[PDB]
Amino acid sequence: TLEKKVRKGIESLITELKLMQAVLSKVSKVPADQLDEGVKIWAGNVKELSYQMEDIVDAFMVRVKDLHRISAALEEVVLQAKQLAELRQRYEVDPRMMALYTDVTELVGIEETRDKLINMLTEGDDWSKHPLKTISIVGFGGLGKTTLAKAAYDKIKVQFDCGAFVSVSRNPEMKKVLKDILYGLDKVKYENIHNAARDEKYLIDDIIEFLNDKRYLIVIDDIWNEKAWELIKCAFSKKSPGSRLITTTRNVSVSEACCSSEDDIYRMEPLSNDVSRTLFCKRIFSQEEGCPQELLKVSEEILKKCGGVPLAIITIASLLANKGHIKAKDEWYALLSSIGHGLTKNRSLEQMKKILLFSYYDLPSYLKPCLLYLSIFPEDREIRRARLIWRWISEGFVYSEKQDISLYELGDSYFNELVNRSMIQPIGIDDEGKVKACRVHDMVLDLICSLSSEENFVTILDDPRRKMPNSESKVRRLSIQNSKIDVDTTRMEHMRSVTVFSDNVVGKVLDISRFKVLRVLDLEGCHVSDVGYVGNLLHLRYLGLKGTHVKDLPMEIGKLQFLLTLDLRGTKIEVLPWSVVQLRRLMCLYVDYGMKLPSGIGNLTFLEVLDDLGLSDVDLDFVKELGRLTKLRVLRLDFHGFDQSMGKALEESISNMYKLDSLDVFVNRGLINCLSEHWVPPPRLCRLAFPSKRSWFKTLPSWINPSSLPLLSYLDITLFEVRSEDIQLLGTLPALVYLEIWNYSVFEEAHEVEAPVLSSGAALFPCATECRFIGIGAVPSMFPQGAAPRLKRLWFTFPAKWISSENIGLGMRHLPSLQRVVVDVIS
Amino acid sequence: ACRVHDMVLDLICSLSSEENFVTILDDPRRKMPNSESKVRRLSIQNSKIDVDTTRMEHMRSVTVFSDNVVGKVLDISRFKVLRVL
Numbered sequence: 001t002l003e004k005k006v007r008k009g010i011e012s013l014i015t016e017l018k019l020m021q022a023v024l025s026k027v028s029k030v031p032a033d034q035l036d037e038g039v040k041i042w043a044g045n046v047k048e049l050s051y052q053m054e055d056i057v058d059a060f061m062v063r064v065k066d067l068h069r070i071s072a073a074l075e076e077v078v079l080q081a082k083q084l085a086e087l088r089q090r091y092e093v094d095p096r097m098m099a100l101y102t103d104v105t106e107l108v109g110i111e112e113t114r115d116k117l118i119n120m121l122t123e124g125d126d127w128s129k130h131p132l133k134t135i136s137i138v139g140f141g142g143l144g145k146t147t148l149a150k151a152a153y154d155k156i157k158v159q160f161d162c163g164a165f166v167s168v169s170r171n172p173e174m175k176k177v178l179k180d181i182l183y184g185l186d187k188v189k190y191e192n193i194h195n196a197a198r199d200e201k202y203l204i205d206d207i208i209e210f211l212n213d214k215r216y217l218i219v220i221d222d223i224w225n226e227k228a229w230e231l232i233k234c235a236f237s238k239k240s241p242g243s244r245l246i247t248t249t250r251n252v253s254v255s256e257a258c259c260s261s262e263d264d265i266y267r268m269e270p271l272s273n274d275v276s277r278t279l280f281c282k283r284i285f286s287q288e289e290g291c292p293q294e295l296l297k298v299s300e301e302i303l304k305k306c307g308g309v310p311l312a313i314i315t316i317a318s319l320l321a322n323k324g325h326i327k328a329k330d331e332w333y334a335l336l337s338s339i340g341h342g343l344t345k346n347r348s349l350e351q352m353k354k355i356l357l358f359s360y361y362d363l364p365s366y367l368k369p370c371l372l373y374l375s376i377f378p379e380d381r382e383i384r385r386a387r388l389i390w391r392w393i394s395e396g397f398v399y400s401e402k403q404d405i406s407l408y409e410l411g412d413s414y415f416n417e418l419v420n421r422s423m424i425q426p427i428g429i430d431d432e433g434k435v436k437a438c439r440v441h442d443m444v445l446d447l448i449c450s451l452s453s454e455e456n457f458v459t460i461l462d463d464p465r466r467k468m469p470n471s472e473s474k475v476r477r478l479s480i481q482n483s484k485i486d487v488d489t490t491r492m493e494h495m496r497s498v499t500v501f502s503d504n505v506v507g508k509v510l511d512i513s514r515f516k517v518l519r520v521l522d523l524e525g526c527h528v529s530d531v532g533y534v535g536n537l538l539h540l541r542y543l544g545l546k547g548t549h550v551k552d553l554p555m556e557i558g559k560l561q562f563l564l565t566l567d568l569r570g571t572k573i574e575v576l577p578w579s580v581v582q583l584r585r586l587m588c589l590y591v592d593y594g595m596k597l598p599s600g601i602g603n604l605t606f607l608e609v610l611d612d613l614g615l616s617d618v619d620l621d622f623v624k625e626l627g628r629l630t631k632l633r634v635l636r637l638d639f640h641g642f643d644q645s646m647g648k649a650l651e652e653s654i655s656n657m658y659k660l661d662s663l664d665v666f667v668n669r670g671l672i673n674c675l676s677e678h679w680v681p682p683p684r685l686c687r688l689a690f691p692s693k694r695s696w697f698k699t700l701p702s703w704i705n706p707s708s709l710p711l712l713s714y715l716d717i718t719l720f721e722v723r724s725e726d727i728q729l730l731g732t733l734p735a736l737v738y739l740e741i742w743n744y745s746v747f748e749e750a751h752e753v754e755a756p757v758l759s760s761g762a763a764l765f766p767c768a769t770e771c772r773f774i775g776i777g778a779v780p781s782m783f784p785q786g787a788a789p790r791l792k793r794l795w796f797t798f799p800a801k802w803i804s805s806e807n808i809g810l811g812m813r814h815l816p817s818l819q820r821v822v823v824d825v826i827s
Numbered sequence: 828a829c830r831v832h833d834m835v836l837d838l839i840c841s842l843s844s845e846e847n848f849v850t851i852l853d854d855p856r857r858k859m860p861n862s863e864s865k866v867r868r869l870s871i872q873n874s875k876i877d878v879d880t881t882r883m884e885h886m887r888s889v890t891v892f893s894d895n896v897v898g899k900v901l902d903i904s905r906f907k908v909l910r911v912l
């Protein structure tokens with residue numbers, strides 16, 4: 001009766017939201033320069049309305065007395081929708097092109113990189129019969145990728161018969177690009193080629209016929225969306241030895257679409273600190289950098305933030321010298337402090353923010369929110385990608401309608417797409433075999449931070465800014481920072497997410513239970529233990545509590561039916577409440593082994609990754625429950641006290657799952673009496689690690705064969721003895737990028753390290769970048785250099801008794817960078 | 828009789844399943860629409876477990892392909908409107 005109308009209004013509401021997101025995605029494509037300002041006001045309002053409507057829908061869906069308030073909110077939200085509708089109806093050249101015409105004798109540091117590039121493509125010009133090859137140059141924003149190409153072009157030009165410098169935009173017109181290529185080749189025969197409009201085809205044929213029996217060196221720069229370039233490639237398809245191509249792009253994933261070989265892809269790096277200092281002083285100062293002596297420290301600090309981008313340095317140098325160091329120690333501090341909050345809103349600096357925002361506008365949808373989510377975290381720190389992915393999934397930015405996806409691999413794809421688009425620097429490798437953490441450039445950071453503050457996406461509280469937007473009623477995301485002063489909490493009822501960064505101001509001054517709705521709650525790095533009110537929260541999806549001094553967890557947490565993640569690492573809790581099996585949806589569960597897991601985990605069927613499961617004092621039904629839930633991807637094992645046929649039971653129980661890709665078992669000073677040689681492994685595995693070293697295997701497992709688990713790229717294996725046939729058996733494994741084997745008997749007993757011999761096969765190492773051998777003598781002369789084309793490091797034991805022997809006749813340079821190696825020699 | 832190319836077939840299958848023209852129950856798929864309310868045409872196939880018939884009241888047509896699961900799990904008589912059977 002009463003509920004029927006609200007149920008039949010919810011679908012109308014969701015359809016309305018779909019149209020609203022459609023139009024919002026449409027308007028956000030064009031840059032805010034060709035967009036009339038009235039439409040911008042309207043779009044902002046429609047965004048706020050979308051927030052309100054989606055909050056209503058989520059409230060209803062989680063809740064189902066509340067029907068009365070929900071219905072009232074429904075009709076009034078319909079009221080604002082209509083009112084805004086009639087209120088709206090009532091009223092109705094490339095910045096980086098000029099940089100190309102810059103003086104040659106102003107570039108600093110071009111010659112070394114330019115000479116390296118010329119000899120890495122012109123090395124075959126001597127005996128100019130090598131087939132044509134292409135060189136891609138990859139970078140982000142402005143790192144002279146275009147300038148360097150022109151510097152190389154202007155030097156080696158007299159030794160080719162043709163040549164053209166042609167550019168491609170974000171959305172090229174293919175006819176224009178090909179006409180430009182034609183016009184540059186000969187300006188006399190094809191003088192008015194831009195007037196003639198034949199088709200995409202006949203002019204490609206014109207190029208092909210014109211490029212008969214010549215060496216050209218055509219350079220094509222700023223290629224986005226490789227689908228564009230695969231049309232140009234058909235212009236260069238006839239064999240033409242002695243001719244080459246140069247390609248530049250800000251998208252690394254389109255470079256392997258070129259030249260088909262990693263050796264030709266030219267990653268290029270920022271300037272060094274010395275060269276950056278020289279360029280910075282050359283623009284501002286007259287002739288000597290030692291004259292001021294008092295803003296030198298400010299100079300190096302401000303130079304550190306740019307890092308090595310000739311762009312940021314050039315813009316800062318211009319802005320900081322209006323007329324000979326207009327002022328010192330005050331405006332330089334102003335520019336140091338203005339990074340992060342407001343430096344972008346300035347003068348003659350906009351000419352470089354367009355060049356940066358090209359990338360951001362190039363993104364598809366569903367990636368703009370993910371990129372903007374970076375504005376939450378502080379300036380200079382590493383962000384763990386797992387935290388990003390889980391926060392994204394809980395926020396709602398990751399979804400699809402394909403049902404063959406787990407929703408986490410999708411987030412990883414989004415992260416990788418952001419990485420390859422040259423917007424995040426990935427560093428480190430975590431235990432999952434993927435990127436550990438990530439960081440963003442400062443000017444990209446403050447740029448997107450201002451862009452987010454332009455709408456109500458994110459609210460940031462800093463001492464340098466000390467500004468709080470005029471409308472406190474409508475705030476969704478809040479990120480508290482070192483500011484522990486303005487902690488107002490009055491008028492945030494619909495509060496989307498909240499986080500605290502290394503601040504004791506949490507708890508004592510700020511209250512959380514006031515927030516009726518709250519999607520995520522991130523609090524890692526605090527030292528507060530009063531969390532018992534989470535039962536009152538109902539829509540909470542993320543609960544991060546890593547290293548938070550929380551003593552105990554409230555029992556009534558089982559009501560939190562909608563939940564996704566639960567991080568409890570680094571805490572002092574030791575027991576989990578029993579009402580955790582009542583909870584239904586989870587995908588990750590970060591629990592240290594010191595904690596005790598109550599029985600009933602078989603209820604949690606949706607689990608996708610479980611970390612550091614401590615198996616101590618467990619009975620068999622609980623052991624076999626683990627194979628019931630067939631959705632885990634990553635699992636971690638450590639134990640000390642059930643080494644029985646219980647081990648065999650769970651050893652065959654793990655095979656019941658088929659979604660695994662990484663595993664590891666931890667046990668100290670013990671043989672692995674769990675794995676039997678007769679057991680099929682999961683069809684998918686990637687890591688299969690074994691962190692403990694005081695444990696061992698009697699023999700190498702037989703089930704590790706090239707037949708099964710052929711996708712391995714990680715071993716971390718240890719065993720008691722060693723046989724010269726195990727290495728040959730292991731080499732036939734397809735990828736095995738990473739290897740690590742330990743000889744327990746050698747480093748525990750008086751065992752003379754023998755020399756295993758590679759009998760069968762020829763190379764056995766198509767790509768094994770890292771190979772580590774402990775307690776095993778691996779001379780570099782297991783095979784000639786054509787065995788492991790990719791091998792950067794090698795570790796082995798070398799007895800001193802083989803120094804006078806003839807079997808260690810090494811000294812040759814193998815194919816990869818096999819020149820920095822130290823061996824622990826034993827007398 | 829007539830025969831259809833295989834990839835044209837599944838191409839048509841996706842092109843028709845993007846809207847609610849027809850609905851297919853297959854073991855390799857085990858994929859169902861979240862809008863269990865709006866289903867018009869049913870094509871039951873080798874799948875004989877996911878034979879749900881809760882909320883399909885606007886059923887234009889049904890078909891069964893050499894499956895003994897017909898009837899014993901699914902009821903036809905409840906479909907108030909039916910074009911073809």
Ligand SMILES: Nc1ncnc2c1ncn2[C@@H]1O[C@H](COP(=O)(O)OP(=O)(O)OP(=O)(O)O)[C@@H](O)[C@H]1O
Pocket residue numbers: 096099102106107108109110139140141142143144145146147148222250279310311314355
């Ligand atoms: N090594 C350098 N020394 C001095 N100035 C430089 C150097 N490299 C680039 N610049 C200046 O910085 C800007 C670099 O332009 P760049 O060639 O980076 O564009 P790009 O690499 O194609 O990047 P984008 O993706 O922005 O087009 C230009 O103003 C250029 O003159």
